Amino acid sequence: PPGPPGPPGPPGPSGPPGPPGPPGPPG
Amino acid sequence: PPGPPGPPGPPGPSGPPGPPGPPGPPG
Amino acid sequence: PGPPGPPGPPGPSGPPGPPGPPGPPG
């Protein structure tokens, strides 16, 4: 018979960068 | 005999977006 | 000798991305 399934793969890539922060306050 | 284990699985999903950046500098 | 087992399952999700850049100036 076939062997058992292999183990899980490695973790995936890092996610994308977050968005820019909010504007600084007006002068 | 049972065969050997299978190969490792594929890489997982990409991770989630990062957090927003900090506020910009004041005007 | 038996055949190999199937591939394993997908791995974990990757870690979060880096923070975004600072926002625009006021």
Side-chain angles (χ1 to χ4, degrees):
Chain A
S14 65
Chain B
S14 286
Chain C
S13 300

Coordinates of all heavy atoms in Angstrom, one line a residue:
Chain A
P1 N 0.8 -1.2 0.0 CA 0.0 0.0 0.0 C 0.8 1.3 0.0 O 2.0 1.3 0.5 CB -0.7 -0.1 1.4 CG 0.2 -0.9 2.2 CD 0.9 -1.9 1.3
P2 N 0.3 2.4 -0.5 CA 0.9 3.7 -0.4 C 1.1 4.1 1.1 O 0.5 3.7 2.1 CB -0.2 4.6 -1.0 CG -0.8 3.7 -2.1 CD -1.0 2.4 -1.3
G3 N 2.2 4.8 1.2 CA 2.7 5.4 2.4 C 1.7 6.4 2.9 O 0.8 6.8 2.2
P4 N 2.0 7.0 4.1 CA 1.1 8.0 4.6 C 1.4 9.3 3.8 O 2.4 9.5 3.2 CB 1.6 8.2 6.0 CG 3.0 7.8 6.0 CD 3.1 6.6 5.0
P5 N 0.5 10.3 3.9 CA 0.8 11.7 3.4 C 2.0 12.2 4.0 O 2.4 12.0 5.1 CB -0.5 12.5 3.7 CG -1.5 11.4 4.0 CD -0.8 10.3 4.6
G6 N 2.7 13.1 3.2 CA 3.8 13.9 3.7 C 3.3 14.9 4.7 O 2.2 15.1 5.0
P7 N 4.3 15.6 5.3 CA 4.0 16.7 6.3 C 3.6 17.9 5.6 O 3.7 18.1 4.4 CB 5.3 16.8 7.1 CG 6.3 16.6 6.0 CD 5.7 15.4 5.2
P8 N 3.1 18.9 6.4 CA 2.7 20.2 5.8 C 3.9 20.9 5.1 O 5.1 20.7 5.5 CB 2.2 21.0 6.9 CG 1.9 20.0 8.0 CD 2.9 18.8 7.8
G9 N 3.6 21.7 4.1 CA 4.6 22.5 3.5 C 5.1 23.6 4.4 O 4.6 23.7 5.5
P10 N 6.1 24.4 3.9 CA 6.6 25.5 4.7 C 5.6 26.6 4.8 O 4.6 26.7 4.0 CB 7.8 25.9 4.0 CG 7.5 25.6 2.5 CD 6.7 24.3 2.6
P11 N 5.8 27.5 5.7 CA 4.9 28.8 5.7 C 5.0 29.5 4.4 O 6.1 29.5 3.7 CB 5.5 29.6 6.9 CG 6.1 28.5 7.8 CD 6.8 27.6 6.8
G12 N 4.0 30.2 4.1 CA 3.9 31.0 2.9 C 4.7 32.3 3.0 O 5.3 32.6 4.0
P13 N 4.7 33.0 1.9 CA 5.4 34.3 1.9 C 4.8 35.3 2.9 O 3.7 35.2 3.3 CB 5.1 34.9 0.5 CG 4.6 33.7 -0.4 CD 4.0 32.7 0.6
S14 N 5.7 36.2 3.3 CA 5.1 37.4 4.0 C 4.1 38.1 3.3 O 4.1 38.1 2.0 CB 6.3 38.3 4.3 OG 6.8 38.8 3.1
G15 N 3.2 38.7 4.1 CA 2.2 39.5 3.5 C 2.7 40.8 2.9 O 3.9 41.2 3.1
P16 N 1.8 41.6 2.2 CA 2.2 42.9 1.7 C 2.4 43.9 2.7 O 1.9 43.8 3.8 CB 1.0 43.2 0.8 CG -0.1 42.5 1.4 CD 0.4 41.2 2.0
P17 N 3.1 45.0 2.4 CA 3.2 46.1 3.3 C 1.9 46.7 3.7 O 1.0 46.7 2.8 CB 4.1 47.1 2.7 CG 4.6 46.5 1.4 CD 3.9 45.2 1.2
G18 N 1.7 47.2 4.9 CA 0.6 48.0 5.2 C 0.5 49.3 4.4 O 1.4 49.7 3.7
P19 N -0.7 50.0 4.6 CA -0.9 51.3 3.9 C -0.1 52.4 4.6 O 0.2 52.3 5.7 CB -2.4 51.5 3.9 CG -2.7 50.9 5.2 CD -1.8 49.6 5.4
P20 N 0.0 53.5 3.9 CA 0.6 54.7 4.5 C -0.2 55.1 5.7 O -1.5 54.9 5.8 CB 0.5 55.8 3.4 CG 0.6 55.0 2.2 CD -0.2 53.8 2.5
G21 N 0.4 55.7 6.7 CA -0.2 56.3 7.8 C -1.1 57.5 7.5 O -1.2 57.9 6.4
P22 N -1.8 58.0 8.5 CA -2.6 59.2 8.3 C -1.7 60.5 8.1 O -0.6 60.5 8.4 CB -3.4 59.3 9.5 CG -2.6 58.7 10.6 CD -1.9 57.6 9.9
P23 N -2.3 61.5 7.5 CA -1.6 62.8 7.4 C -1.2 63.3 8.8 O -1.8 63.1 9.8 CB -2.6 63.8 6.8 CG -3.6 62.9 6.1 CD -3.7 61.6 6.9
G24 N -0.1 64.1 8.8 CA 0.3 64.8 10.0 C -0.7 66.0 10.1 O -1.5 66.3 9.2
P25 N -0.7 66.6 11.3 CA -1.7 67.7 11.5 C -1.3 69.0 10.7 O -0.2 69.1 10.4 CB -1.4 68.0 13.0 CG -0.1 67.5 13.3 CD 0.2 66.3 12.4
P26 N -2.3 69.8 10.3 CA -1.9 71.0 9.6 C -1.1 71.9 10.5 O -1.1 71.8 11.7 CB -3.2 71.7 9.3 CG -4.2 71.1 10.3 CD -3.8 69.7 10.6
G27 N -0.4 72.9 9.9 CA 0.4 73.9 10.6 C -0.6 75.0 11.1 O -0.2 75.9 11.8
Chain B
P1 N 5.4 -3.9 2.1 CA 5.4 -3.0 3.2 C 4.7 -1.7 2.8 O 4.7 -1.4 1.6 CB 6.9 -2.7 3.4 CG 7.5 -4.0 3.1 CD 6.8 -4.4 1.8
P2 N 4.0 -0.9 3.7 CA 3.6 0.4 3.2 C 4.8 1.2 2.6 O 5.9 1.1 3.1 CB 2.9 1.2 4.3 CG 2.7 0.1 5.4 CD 3.7 -1.0 5.1
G3 N 4.4 2.0 1.6 CA 5.5 2.8 1.0 C 5.9 3.9 1.9 O 5.4 4.1 3.0
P4 N 6.9 4.7 1.5 CA 7.3 5.8 2.4 C 6.3 6.9 2.4 O 5.5 7.0 1.5 CB 8.6 6.2 1.7 CG 8.4 5.9 0.3 CD 7.6 4.6 0.2
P5 N 6.5 7.8 3.3 CA 5.7 9.0 3.3 C 5.8 9.8 2.1 O 6.9 9.8 1.4 CB 6.2 9.8 4.5 CG 6.8 8.7 5.4 CD 7.5 7.8 4.4
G6 N 4.8 10.5 1.7 CA 4.8 11.4 0.6 C 5.7 12.6 0.9 O 6.2 12.8 2.0
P7 N 5.9 13.4 -0.1 CA 6.7 14.7 0.0 C 6.0 15.7 0.9 O 4.7 15.6 1.0 CB 6.8 15.2 -1.4 CG 5.6 14.6 -2.1 CD 5.3 13.3 -1.5
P8 N 6.7 16.7 1.3 CA 6.0 17.8 2.0 C 5.0 18.5 1.0 O 5.2 18.5 -0.2 CB 7.2 18.8 2.3 CG 8.4 18.0 2.3 CD 8.2 16.8 1.3
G9 N 4.0 19.1 1.6 CA 3.0 19.9 0.9 C 3.6 21.1 0.4 O 4.7 21.5 0.6
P10 N 2.7 21.9 -0.3 CA 3.1 23.2 -0.9 C 3.2 24.2 0.2 O 2.7 24.1 1.3 CB 2.0 23.4 -1.9 CG 0.8 22.8 -1.2 CD 1.3 21.6 -0.5
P11 N 3.9 25.3 -0.1 CA 4.0 26.5 0.7 C 2.6 27.0 1.0 O 1.7 26.9 0.2 CB 4.8 27.5 0.0 CG 5.5 26.7 -1.1 CD 4.7 25.5 -1.4
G12 N 2.4 27.5 2.2 CA 1.1 28.0 2.6 C 0.8 29.4 1.9 O 1.6 29.9 1.2
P13 N -0.4 29.9 2.2 CA -0.8 31.2 1.7 C 0.1 32.3 2.1 O 0.8 32.3 3.1 CB -2.2 31.5 2.4 CG -2.7 30.1 2.8 CD -1.4 29.3 3.1
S14 N 0.1 33.4 1.3 CA 0.8 34.6 1.8 C 0.1 35.2 3.0 O -1.1 35.0 3.3 CB 0.7 35.7 0.7 OG 1.5 35.5 -0.4
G15 N 1.0 35.8 3.9 CA 0.4 36.4 5.1 C -0.4 37.6 4.8 O -0.5 38.1 3.7
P16 N -1.0 38.1 5.9 CA -1.9 39.3 5.8 C -1.1 40.6 5.7 O 0.2 40.6 5.9 CB -2.6 39.2 7.1 CG -1.6 38.7 8.0 CD -0.9 37.6 7.3
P17 N -1.7 41.7 5.2 CA -1.1 43.0 5.2 C -0.5 43.4 6.5 O -1.0 43.1 7.6 CB -2.1 43.9 4.7 CG -3.2 43.1 4.1 CD -3.1 41.7 4.7
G18 N 0.6 44.1 6.5 CA 1.1 44.8 7.6 C 0.2 45.9 8.1 O -0.7 46.3 7.5
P19 N 0.6 46.4 9.3 CA -0.2 47.5 9.9 C 0.1 48.8 9.1 O 1.1 48.9 8.4 CB 0.4 47.6 11.3 CG 1.7 47.1 11.2 CD 1.7 46.1 10.1
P20 N -0.8 49.8 9.3 CA -0.5 51.1 8.7 C 0.8 51.7 9.3 O 1.2 51.4 10.4 CB -1.7 52.0 9.0 CG -2.7 51.0 9.5 CD -2.1 49.8 10.0
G21 N 1.4 52.6 8.5 CA 2.5 53.4 9.0 C 2.0 54.5 10.0 O 0.8 54.7 10.1
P22 N 2.9 55.1 10.6 CA 2.6 56.2 11.6 C 2.2 57.5 10.9 O 2.3 57.6 9.7 CB 3.9 56.4 12.3 CG 4.9 56.1 11.3 CD 4.4 55.0 10.5
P23 N 1.6 58.4 11.7 CA 1.3 59.7 11.0 C 2.4 60.4 10.4 O 3.6 60.3 10.8 CB 0.7 60.5 12.2 CG 0.3 59.5 13.2 CD 1.3 58.5 13.1
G24 N 2.1 61.2 9.3 CA 3.1 62.1 8.7 C 3.5 63.2 9.6 O 2.9 63.4 10.7
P25 N 4.5 63.9 9.2 CA 4.9 65.0 10.0 C 4.0 66.2 10.0 O 3.3 66.3 9.0 CB 6.2 65.5 9.4 CG 6.1 65.0 8.0 CD 5.3 63.7 8.0
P26 N 3.9 67.1 11.0 CA 3.1 68.2 11.0 C 3.3 69.2 9.9 O 4.4 69.3 9.4 CB 3.4 69.0 12.3 CG 3.9 67.8 13.2 CD 4.7 66.9 12.3
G27 N 2.3 70.0 9.5 CA 2.4 71.1 8.6 C 3.0 72.3 9.3 O 3.4 72.1 10.5
Chain C
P1 N 7.9 -3.2 -2.0 CA 7.9 -1.8 -1.6 C 6.7 -1.1 -2.1 O 6.3 -1.1 -3.3 CB 9.2 -1.3 -2.2 CG 9.8 -2.4 -2.9 CD 8.8 -3.5 -3.1
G2 N 6.0 -0.4 -1.2 CA 4.8 0.2 -1.5 C 5.0 1.6 -2.2 O 6.2 2.1 -2.1
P3 N 4.0 2.1 -2.8 CA 4.2 3.5 -3.4 C 4.3 4.5 -2.4 O 3.8 4.4 -1.3 CB 3.0 3.7 -4.3 CG 2.2 2.4 -4.1 CD 2.7 1.7 -3.0
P4 N 4.9 5.7 -2.8 CA 4.9 6.8 -1.8 C 3.5 7.3 -1.5 O 2.6 7.2 -2.3 CB 5.7 7.9 -2.5 CG 5.7 7.5 -4.0 CD 5.5 6.0 -4.0
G5 N 3.3 7.8 -0.3 CA 2.1 8.6 0.0 C 2.0 9.9 -0.8 O 2.9 10.2 -1.5
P6 N 0.8 10.5 -0.7 CA 0.6 11.7 -1.4 C 1.3 12.9 -0.7 O 1.7 12.8 0.4 CB -0.9 11.9 -1.4 CG -1.3 11.3 -0.1 CD -0.4 10.1 0.0
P7 N 1.5 14.0 -1.4 CA 2.0 15.2 -0.8 C 1.2 15.6 0.4 O 0.0 15.4 0.5 CB 2.0 16.3 -1.9 CG 2.0 15.5 -3.2 CD 1.2 14.3 -2.9
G8 N 1.9 16.2 1.3 CA 1.3 16.8 2.5 C 0.4 18.0 2.2 O 0.3 18.4 1.1
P9 N -0.2 18.5 3.3 CA -1.1 19.6 3.1 C -0.4 20.9 3.0 O 0.8 21.0 3.3 CB -1.9 19.6 4.4 CG -1.1 18.9 5.4 CD -0.2 17.9 4.6
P10 N -1.0 22.0 2.5 CA -0.4 23.3 2.5 C 0.1 23.7 3.9 O -0.5 23.3 4.9 CB -1.5 24.2 2.1 CG -2.5 23.4 1.3 CD -2.4 22.0 2.0
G11 N 1.2 24.4 3.9 CA 1.8 24.9 5.1 C 0.9 26.1 5.7 O 0.0 26.5 5.1
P12 N 1.4 26.6 6.8 CA 0.7 27.8 7.4 C 0.8 29.0 6.5 O 1.7 29.1 5.7 CB 1.6 28.1 8.7 CG 2.3 26.8 9.0 CD 2.6 26.2 7.6
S13 N -0.1 29.9 6.7 CA 0.1 31.3 6.1 C 1.4 31.9 6.6 O 1.8 31.6 7.7 CB -1.1 32.1 6.5 OG -2.3 31.5 5.9
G14 N 2.0 32.7 5.8 CA 3.1 33.5 6.2 C 2.8 34.6 7.2 O 1.6 34.8 7.5
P15 N 3.8 35.2 7.7 CA 3.7 36.2 8.7 C 3.1 37.5 8.1 O 3.1 37.7 6.8 CB 5.1 36.5 9.2 CG 6.0 36.1 8.0 CD 5.2 35.0 7.3
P16 N 2.6 38.4 8.8 CA 2.2 39.8 8.3 C 3.3 40.5 7.6 O 4.5 40.3 7.9 CB 1.8 40.5 9.6 CG 1.4 39.5 10.5 CD 2.4 38.4 10.3
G17 N 2.9 41.3 6.6 CA 3.9 42.2 6.0 C 4.4 43.3 7.0 O 3.9 43.4 8.1
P18 N 5.3 44.1 6.5 CA 5.9 45.2 7.3 C 4.9 46.3 7.4 O 4.0 46.4 6.6 CB 7.1 45.6 6.5 CG 6.7 45.3 5.1 CD 5.9 44.0 5.2
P19 N 5.2 47.2 8.3 CA 4.3 48.4 8.4 C 4.4 49.2 7.1 O 5.4 49.2 6.4 CB 4.9 49.1 9.6 CG 5.5 48.1 10.4 CD 6.2 47.2 9.4
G20 N 3.3 50.0 6.8 CA 3.4 50.9 5.8 C 4.3 52.1 6.1 O 4.8 52.3 7.2
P21 N 4.5 53.0 5.1 CA 5.3 54.2 5.3 C 4.6 55.2 6.2 O 3.3 55.2 6.3 CB 5.5 54.6 3.9 CG 4.2 54.1 3.2 CD 3.9 52.8 3.8
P22 N 5.3 56.2 6.7 CA 4.6 57.3 7.3 C 3.6 58.0 6.3 O 3.8 58.0 5.1 CB 5.7 58.2 7.8 CG 7.0 57.5 7.7 CD 6.7 56.3 6.7
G23 N 2.6 58.6 6.9 CA 1.6 59.3 6.0 C 2.2 60.6 5.5 O 3.4 60.9 5.8
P24 N 1.4 61.3 4.7 CA 1.8 62.5 4.1 C 1.9 63.6 5.2 O 1.4 63.6 6.2 CB 0.7 62.8 3.1 CG -0.5 62.1 3.7 CD 0.0 60.9 4.4
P25 N 2.7 64.7 4.9 CA 2.9 65.8 5.8 C 1.5 66.5 5.9 O 0.8 66.5 4.9 CB 3.9 66.7 5.2 CG 3.7 66.4 3.7 CD 3.5 64.9 3.6
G26 N 1.3 67.1 7.0 CA 0.1 68.0 7.1 C 0.4 69.2 6.1 O 1.5 69.3 5.5

